[PDB]
Design an enzyme around this catalytic site. Structure first.
Site: not given
Ligand SMILES: O=C(O)/C(O)=C\c1ccc(O)cc1
Ligand SMILES: O=C(O)C(=O)Cc1ccc(O)cc1
Ligand SMILES: CC(C)c1nn2ccccc2c1C(=O)[C@@H](C)N
Ligand SMILES: O=C(O)C(=O)Cc1ccc(O)cc1
Ligand SMILES: [Cl-]
Ligand SMILES: [Cl-]
Ligand SMILES: [Cl-]
Ligand SMILES: [Cl-]
Ligand SMILES: [Cl-]
Ligand SMILES: [Cl-]
Ligand SMILES: [Cl-]
Ligand SMILES: [Cl-]
Lengths: 114, 114, 114
Positions: A1, A32, A64, A97
Site C-alpha cells: 500500500p 500488509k 491492492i 481518498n
Molecule cells: O464530494 C463531496 O461531497 C465532499 O464534500 C468532499 C469530498 C472530499 C474528497 C473527495 O475526494 C471528494 C469529495
Molecule cells: O497492496 C499491496 O499488495 C501493494 O503492493 C500495495 C499497493 C497498493 C496500491 C498502490 O497504489 C500501491 C501499493
C-alpha cells in the site's frame, strides 16, 4: 500500500519519526507486510479546506484489496488520529481518498503484481 | 470536492485570493457547499507538457457525484478560464483528471462519507 | 497521457534532459504523440518505502487506453529501467500506479476529450 499526506503544516512541525510511525501503523491496519508499505508526507503546502487555511490535510491510501466500507472507516479513525496527535490537524479538516487497485495496475520491480 | 493544481508557474505569480476564488467558483459549479471544498495549488514544479516547459498545469477534481460528460466539460471551461486569467496558462496546456468518488472511499472526521 | 514521479532523490541528481527523455520514451511506449504527453518530476520528497529512506519513487501513469496487463508490465520495465539508470533508484523501491482514463473524465483546453 501507499499513503500520501499533503498539508499546509510547516516542515518543522512534522515530528521526528512520523514516516516510521505511519509505516508501522499502516502495516498493522492493512495487514500488509511492512516491506510493502510506502509513505509520503508533503508539508508547507498552499491549500484551503472550506475556504480556510487553518491546518488541514489531503491524503490518499492506495492498496491492492483491503479497501471497503468498514475497513476505510477504521483507516480514517487511525489516520485522522495520527494527524491530530502529531500534526495538530483537526479530524474535520482531513480528507482521505481510498483506492482499491487492481494488481495489474500496480508496477513494481520491473513488472506488475498481476 | 477536492481540487488540486500542479504547475510550473512560480509561487509569486499566483495572485492573492486564488484559493478563495477556486473555492467559491467550485462551490457554484458543483452545487456543493463551500465548507466542503478543498483546494490545493502547487507552484514551481518541474514539468513538461507536449515536450516543452512553457506554463502548464496538471490538475484533478474529485467529487462524490456531480461528475459526468456535460458537467466535466463545464468544469473544464470554468477551470481553464481561471488558470488562463490568473496564472496565464494556455488552456491547451492544462489537463484535469475527473474522479467520481464513492462515498465509502472518502475519509473525513475519523470516518467516511458512506 | 500523464506521468508523475515523486522521489526522495535530490533535485541536483535529476539529469538535464530527463523530462524530455521521459516524454520521448513514453511517446514510443504508448504510441501517443509527444504533443499530448505531460511529465512531472518531484524531487527532494519526504518519503519511505518499507520503512526505509533509501532512494525510492512513487509514480503514476494516466492514459486514455493503452493500459492493460501486458502493456503495464512493459511500461514497468521501461520506467523502472529509466529510474534506475538516471536517478539511481532500485526497481524494487518503485511503485507505479496505472490509470486507464475515460475520455469524458479528462479535461483539456476548455472541454474534455470525449
Ligand atoms: O464530494 C463531496 O461531497 C465532499 O464534500 C468532499 C469530498 C472530499 C474528497 C473527495 O475526494 C471528494 C469529495
Ligand atoms: O497492496 C499491496 O499488495 C501493494 O503492493 C500495495 C499497493 C497498493 C496500491 C498502490 O497504489 C500501491 C501499493
Ligand atoms: C512479488 C511479491 C512477493 C512482493 N511484492 N512486494 C512489494 C514490495 C516489497 C516486496 C515485495 C515482494 C517480495 O516479497 C519479493 C520477494 N518479491
Ligand atoms: O491518452 C491520451 O489520449 C492522452 O491524451 C494523454 C493523457 C491520458 C490521461 C490523462 O489523465 C492525461 C493525459
Ligand atoms: Cl470492509
Ligand atoms: Cl464500521
Ligand atoms: Cl485499478
Ligand atoms: Cl453530466
Ligand atoms: Cl455539453
Ligand atoms: Cl471510488
Ligand atoms: Cl495489455
Ligand atoms: Cl475514468
Amino acid at each position: 500500500p501507499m499513503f500520501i499526506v499533503n498539508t499546509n503544516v510547516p516542515r518543522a512541525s512534522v515530528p521526528d519519526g512520523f514516516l516510521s510511525e505511519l509505516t508501522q501503523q499502516l502495516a498493522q491496519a492493512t495487514g500488509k507486510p511492512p516491506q510493502y508499505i510506502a509513505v509520503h508526507v508533503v508539508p508547507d503546502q498552499l491549500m484551503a479546506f472550506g475556504g480556510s487555511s487553518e491546518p488541514c490535510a489531503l491524503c490518499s491510501l492506495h492498496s491492492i484489496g483491503k479497501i471497503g466500507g468498514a475497513q476505510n472507516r477504521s483507516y480514517s479513525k487511525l489516520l485522522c488520529g495520527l494527524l491530530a496527535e502529531r500534526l495538530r490537524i483537526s479530524p474535520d479538516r482531513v480528507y482521505i481518498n481510498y483506492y482499491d487497485m487492481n494488481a495489474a495496475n500496480v508496477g513494481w520491480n520491473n513488472s506488475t503484481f498481476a
